[PDB]
Amino acid sequence: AFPIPX
């Protein structure tokens, strides 16, 4: 989930 590359 942006800004999380997961």
How far apart are the two ends of the chain, measured CA to CA in Å? 6
Number of residues written out for the chain: 6
Rg (CA), the chain: 4
Q: Where is 1: in which H helix or E strand?
A: none
Identify residue 1 by its one-letter amino acid code: A
Q: What technique solved it?
A: NMR
Identify residue 5 by its one-letter amino acid code: P
Residue 3's region, left for phi above 0, alpha for psi from -120 to 50, else beta, is alpha
